[PDB]
Amino acid sequence: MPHAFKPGDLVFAKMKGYPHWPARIDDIADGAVKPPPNKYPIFFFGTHETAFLGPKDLFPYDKSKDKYGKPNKRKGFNEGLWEIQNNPHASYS
């Protein structure tokens, strides 16, 4: 059965203006800014940016990869697809 999102979970994350984007649930460092209520730090593969999103915008990776994993022209997208498929838990900073 599913659980609440935890650090390391792999998703596609949706933001307005962008296709569903390969991402992971990140940890919160000490003293860093914490997310708003019921939001999570989302690390976007490829672009290597982080945003706070809620679960309604987070789609578990294996269930959604057939629908959202197709290559496209957006900057960083294809590299993000490679990262989530080949080394999704590595350090990209």
Contacting positions for ligand A1II2 (CB under 6 A):
15, 18, 21, 44, 47, 49, 51
Nearest distance in Å: CB 34, ligand A1II2: 15
Nearest distance in Å: CB 21, ligand A1II2: 4
Closer to ligand A1II2 by Cβ: residue 74 or 89: 74
Decide if 61 contacts 1 (C-beta within 8 A). Answer: no
Instruction: Find the Cα–Cα–Cα–Cα dihedral 85, 87, 89, 90, rounded to 10°.
Output: -150
